[PDB]
Design a protein around this ligand. Sequence first.
Ligand SMILES: *C/C=C(C)/C=C/C=C(C)/C=C/C1=C(C)CCCC1(C)C
Ligand SMILES: *C/C=C(C)/C=C/C=C(C)/C=C/C1=C(C)CCCC1(C)C
Ligand SMILES: *C/C=C(C)/C=C/C=C(C)/C=C/C1=C(C)CCCC1(C)C
Ligand SMILES: [K+]
Ligand SMILES: [K+]
Ligand SMILES: [K+]
Ligand SMILES: [K+]
Ligand SMILES: [K+]
Ligand SMILES: [K+]
Ligand SMILES: [K+]
Ligand SMILES: [K+]
Ligand SMILES: [K+]
Ligand SMILES: [K+]
Ligand SMILES: [K+]
Ligand SMILES: [K+]
Ligand SMILES: [K+]
Ligand SMILES: [K+]
Ligand SMILES: [K+]
Lengths: 259, 259, 259
Amino acid sequence: PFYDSRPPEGWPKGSINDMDYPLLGSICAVCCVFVAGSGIWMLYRLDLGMGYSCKPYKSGRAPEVNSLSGIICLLCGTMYAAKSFDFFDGGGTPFSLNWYWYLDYVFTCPLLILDFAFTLDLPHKIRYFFAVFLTLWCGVAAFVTPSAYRFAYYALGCCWFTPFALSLMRHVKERYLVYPPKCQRWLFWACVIFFGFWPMFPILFIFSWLGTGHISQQAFYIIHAFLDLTCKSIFGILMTVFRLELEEHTEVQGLPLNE
Amino acid sequence: PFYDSRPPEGWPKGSINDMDYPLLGSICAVCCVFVAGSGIWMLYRLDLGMGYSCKPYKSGRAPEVNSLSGIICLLCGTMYAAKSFDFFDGGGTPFSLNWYWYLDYVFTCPLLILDFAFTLDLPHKIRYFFAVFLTLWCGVAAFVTPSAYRFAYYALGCCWFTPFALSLMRHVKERYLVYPPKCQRWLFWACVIFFGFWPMFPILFIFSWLGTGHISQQAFYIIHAFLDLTCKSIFGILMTVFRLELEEHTEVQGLPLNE
Amino acid sequence: PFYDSRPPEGWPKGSINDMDYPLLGSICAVCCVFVAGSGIWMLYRLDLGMGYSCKPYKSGRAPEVNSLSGIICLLCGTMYAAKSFDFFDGGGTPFSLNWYWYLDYVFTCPLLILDFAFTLDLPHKIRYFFAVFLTLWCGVAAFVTPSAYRFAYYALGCCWFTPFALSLMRHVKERYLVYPPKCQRWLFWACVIFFGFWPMFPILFIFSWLGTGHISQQAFYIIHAFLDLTCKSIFGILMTVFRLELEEHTEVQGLPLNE
Ligand SMILES: *C/C=C(C)/C=C/C=C(C)/C=C/C1=C(C)CCCC1(C)C
Ligand SMILES: *C/C=C(C)/C=C/C=C(C)/C=C/C1=C(C)CCCC1(C)C
Ligand SMILES: *C/C=C(C)/C=C/C=C(C)/C=C/C1=C(C)CCCC1(C)C
Ligand SMILES: [K+]
Ligand SMILES: [K+]
Ligand SMILES: [K+]
Ligand SMILES: [K+]
Ligand SMILES: [K+]
Ligand SMILES: [K+]
Ligand SMILES: [K+]
Ligand SMILES: [K+]
Ligand SMILES: [K+]
Ligand SMILES: [K+]
Ligand SMILES: [K+]
Ligand SMILES: [K+]
Ligand SMILES: [K+]
Ligand SMILES: [K+]
Ligand SMILES: [K+]
């Protein structure tokens, strides 16, 4: 979708693309390594077996949806490797995963909510998937729109995230009482990460360079690198641990849920 | 995928983009509101229960594929909100869902045929999905190609829609005798909308500005807004009512199908 | 995603796009016809019945995943029809499926590995799908990157294909002993095509115009046309024949597998 490119003399001084590119490339490389390693660990732990006792799967293989967390983390890590390649080249690279904001998210976050719904057996998985998909596409549209109508696109996204976040929460509550306290301990932190950091993105939009202008694009890249390290890597680790505790309770010990 | 933009002095007079943009923006906003409200109603009615008696679901949740109609309608409504944003900005907006014809359809219509197949238990759901996908991509290619080879792409699309429409019809007939007359009443109008309005798009191509030149791009936008009002909103409402009648016959009353 | 176009005077002499376009268009048309016909034959044979005796399906329809091979072949054939349209127009066509290398593959090869996993009941189908997806996107990034960092993207792809190919092979071996010798005969040639021709693409990258410079873009197009003739058409035919033999062994004759 690219039309712009880095000028032969470099990015104009004072522009939003006049950024510390070696630093952002190093940060993206570190994030890539961490998130890819976390996803590899989640996949390996899932293949180890059910629960903390590593009870072998009856079919000999893990459920396919259970590998969503590791796949999302590895995909995010490879996206961050591409981002580091783009940043180390000075930005404006033909295959830039940094240029179009939230364009890389339309692959990870719908999958992330799908994994969250599959782990918690949340209803309307397709509805949540498409809600997150449309919210992220509204964000991409707002970030590529140079006029005031971007705040319309933002608002359109806010017309999707506000109900979805209000719906999911309620549904999550209906599941929260079902699970044992040991699994509830990890579910609490997964929900904290979700309902605390997902709302951060729309708030960070307001104070970005296309909002009040308080956060620059470089600071935006750093903040979103930390957010992806939290929203994908740490959230996936917490989902893996919650799944291990649930399998230990229900499959290893044979105990029923509080439903 | 964008390269062109609205010239600083505006669209050249007499060009295909010299269009009544406030009117098209208002039409797109009205279509967005109507289709999004219809999709919200479909999802709410699906969550109400099975059939006209609103019999509660045994699992407590509706089937995931049953929410396809409302999801398609909400996605189309948000696409039309984006279209109204693009039109009210004067067109040629970086995130324009109006520029590339049938590009927005590659998300709605494959899902639409998937929903139709799931509701009627039609065979080869993946085959129909990919047939519609390839037909719409051939249409996008024909609309972005400025040479005569666009009529090749159009022909390629006609090499996909003609068999598919001839196949689906036959398969639909095999299902039409299965359902009771009350459900057949809604199935008749759903099939009327399908086999009447889906062929309209290739016919409208012939008389468009890249065909015979009788229908301008503004008139094309209005006609396709009405078509999406019929093909997505009304067709989804008819699918919801047919599903309600089928659930009343088979689940509420326990009566069997005529198979 | 297009920004470049064929210059009004034509492609500059000596450039990578100064190619024999009538010849490439004819080759692409022949490949389109062959692959589309092969996919049509696979779908028709699948609809005929299970095994060589054409035992009717109990549900009256073939499994949906069983039609993946024919769908992939038909999609590749239509992509090659579009490629022939682009080449016959002189290249640089707005909807060019030839410009961005491996961009058309991100639709066929993830589906190809999905079909291979479904036919052989290979574990971690989603993992293999996403591994191939990310490998192909790394290839697209390497082919659109003009700097040395393309060899980074290539390396990133080599960081995905090398484990996946090493994993799938092992998993394939676990399935190879399960199947009878008659099905093993077709599985051997399917695995030969896979593990011989899939590694060819990264090797062909090294000697292409963005590598050592020994293979031109025209020769690359011809070689990849033959590869798609082998990797999609012949591999799909071998999958269809292996499925027929497996259904004859297990469904027609009722014999069990060697598991
Ligand atoms: C790892 C990345 C994650 C979890 C990204 C999440 C993204 C969102 C919650 C998106 C938020 C937006 C909307 C609420 C509308 C306005 C635009 C966005 C993209 C900031
Ligand atoms: C709500 C939108 C709908 C139902 C769109 C349907 C689209 C088609 C039936 C597409 C038709 C085309 C072909 C038959 C080939 C030539 C190009 C098209 C896109 C006009
Ligand atoms: C019909 C097309 C097929 C089977 C294509 C297969 C593609 C690959 C095995 C891709 C290979 C690549 C990597 C190993 C990384 C470097 C870039 C590629 C695209 C050459
Ligand atoms: K799961
Ligand atoms: K996992
Ligand atoms: K990007
Ligand atoms: K970005
Ligand atoms: K940017
Ligand atoms: K349905
Ligand atoms: K619905
Ligand atoms: K568009
Ligand atoms: K349009
Ligand atoms: K246009
Ligand atoms: K299969
Ligand atoms: K097949
Ligand atoms: K292409
Ligand atoms: K190509
Ligand atoms: K090229």
